[PDB]
Amino acid sequence: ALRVLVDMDGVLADFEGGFLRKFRARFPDQPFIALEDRRGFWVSEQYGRLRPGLSEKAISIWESKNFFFELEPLPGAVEAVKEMASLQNTDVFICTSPIKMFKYCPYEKYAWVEKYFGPDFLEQIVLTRDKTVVSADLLIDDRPDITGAEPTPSWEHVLFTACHNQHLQLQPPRRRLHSWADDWKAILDSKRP
Amino acid sequence: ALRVLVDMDGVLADFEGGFLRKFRARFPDQPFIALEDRRGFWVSEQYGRLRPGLSEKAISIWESKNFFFELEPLPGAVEAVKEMASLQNTDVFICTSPIKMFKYCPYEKYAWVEKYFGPDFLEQIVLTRDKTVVSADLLIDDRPDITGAEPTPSWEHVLFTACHNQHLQLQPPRRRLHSWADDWKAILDSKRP
Ligand SMILES: Cc1cn([C@H]2C[C@H]3O[C@](c4ccc(C(=O)O)cc4)(P(=O)(O)O)OC[C@H]3O2)c(=O)[nH]c1=O
Ligand SMILES: Cc1cn([C@H]2C[C@H]3O[C@](c4ccc(C(=O)O)cc4)(P(=O)(O)O)OC[C@H]3O2)c(=O)[nH]c1=O
Ligand SMILES: [K+]
Ligand SMILES: [K+]
Ligand SMILES: [K+]
Ligand SMILES: [K+]
């Protein structure tokens, strides 16, 4: 069976839009970064450059109760993953790294998966900071630099497009999934025997 | 680097003793199973055979708030894993499956790891129901039957002895770690290049 790992934040759940909305509501007198002007993976770093103390204020949004639970799905994400999981000879796992503050985030990610995919899909969740030690054919993740304890992961990393990575030139033969409307079936098929 | 996955319940944390203590306290008029009389991996199944309704009462102990957090370490477990992690060319991850009710268990497992191993060790946690998709040289786990989506896991499963598995005849060349006092360094060394 083909095995596909799907990232959660920025791939299934709209982390960037949820963050921005809550930041602006909580900190209406601070400057912010429009989604179109996001550059680089780390939200907090971009905000820290924008003004002193803004990194810590950004962090405070995602460390808050209900931040993860209340993220809206990306367009097409829930439908695509449900279809993907239902395909013959195809195992799908949601492989997600929780933030360092653990009071809410792990719990909310399970709750979010239950909400959008149902109880039986909880079995498909892998929470890990290191995705390199999870073996699979494909990893669909918006982070450009995925590293860890395994220097040669078994998966091919397909870069899921986001605001923060859309201008990046990747090294051949690295590939992208532009959105869930893009042809994810063709990418899966290219790895099948 | 050698990669070792270490199970949590029944290997690092004394699930069986914690369960029994809390069961007897909450249900003092019910029969129970002494640790020495534990047979088979699933606590709940053994209790359900003992009397009608006891499976659900057992489950209610581990679904309760603070059950996971308040488990005591096994003798030698914290010291061994700290030493193991500090060895040259050795990466250690705690690979643990949370129960199906997710309100407390994921959170408490992170909190427990922080308590006994410190904040930096949180990075070494993998929460998953399927350990077969986690690649490693060794998996030290008290469950006899470890299966999942990967039919040929990369790890060798070393069976950690517990009450419930101590009489089991394993198929050659399956091996055991009897306790943390047993010679876990020799087992690791047998897998090094
Ligand atoms: C931890 C962390 C996260 N973020 C943004 C970027 C993105 O990263 C992750 C993330 C979470 C944890 C780690 C880690 O423990 O190293 C890394 C990335 P994702 O990989 O998408 O889940 O967390 C949610 C998002 O939050 C950020 O801007 N700064 C941070 O310090
Ligand atoms: C879920 C479950 C667990 N247990 C006992 C046995 C042992 O199993 C695990 C466990 C937890 C979840 C699953 C699962 O989702 O399939 C399986 C085993 P462990 O692997 O040691 O963490 O949970 C803690 C312990 O709890 C039990 O007796 N019956 C159960 O239905
Ligand atoms: K992400
Ligand atoms: K399937
Ligand atoms: K166990
Ligand atoms: K080490």
Domain with residue B1: its CATH number is 3.40.50.1000
Experimental method, per PDB record: X-ray
Residues B65 and B77 in one domain: no
A175: β partners: A158
**What residues have a C-beta under 5 A from ligand 3, the ion?**
A 7, 9-10, 142
CA dihedral A33, A37, A39, A43 (to 10 degrees): 20
Residues A75 and A49 in one domain: no
Whether A9 sits among the annotated catalytic residues: the reply is yes
Q: Which residues neighbour A82 within 8 Å (Cβ) at sequence distance 6 or greater?
A: A117
Mutate to test the pocket of ligand 1, among A99, A132, A134 (most ligand atoms within 8 A of CB): A99
CA distance A108 to A114: 10
Taking each helix axis as running N to C, give the angle between helix A54-62 and helix A43-50, from 0 to 180 degrees, rounded to the nearest 10: 150
Domains of chain B: total: 2
Nearest CA to ligand 1 atom 6: A42
CA distance B165 to B169: 9
Please identify, by atom number, the ligand 2 atom nearest to the C-alpha of residue B62.
26
Residues A63 and A127 in one domain: no
Give me Rg for the CA atoms of chain B. Answer: 17
CB pair distance less than 8 Å for A123 and B106: no
The DSSP call for residue A155 is S
Chain B residues with CB under 8 Å of A129 CB are: 122-123, 125
Strands (E), chain A: 2-6, 90-96, 125-128, 138-141, 156-160, 175-177
Ligand found nearest the CA of B41: 2
Residues B77 and B100 in one domain: yes
CA distance A155 to A146: 11
Residues B38 and B107 in one domain: no
Residue carrying the six token digits 């990194």 = A55
CB B67 within 8 A of CB B22: yes
Interface of B with A in 12-71 (CB under 8 A): none
CA distance A35 to A166: 11
In CATH, what number is assigned to the domain containing residue B23? 1.10.40.40
Cis amide leading into B173 (omega within 30): yes
| Resolution of the structure in the document, Å | 1.7
Residues B122 and B55 in one domain: no
**CA max distance for chain B:** 55
Domain with B30 in it: 15-69
Residues B101 and B155 in one domain: yes
CB contact, 8 Å: A102 with chain B?
yes
Residues B139 and B45 in one domain: no
Residues B94 and B171 in one domain: yes
CB A17 within 8 A of CB A77: no
Annotated ligand binding at B115? The verdict is no
The DSSP call for residue A9 is B
Q: Which residues neighbour A54 within 8 Å (Cβ) at sequence distance 6 or greater?
A: A30, A31, A47, A48
Cis amide leading into B153 (omega within 30): no
At CA A163, angle to CA A158 and CA A169, rounded to 5? Answer: 55
Nearest CA to ligand 1 atom 8: A42
CA distance B45 to B49: 6
Q: Which residues neighbour B61 within 8 Å (Cβ) at sequence distance 6 or greater?
A: B19, B22, B23, B26, B67
How would you classify the pairing of strands B2-6 and A138-141?
unpaired
Phi, psi of A2 (to 5 degrees): -65, 135
A126: β partners: A95, B128
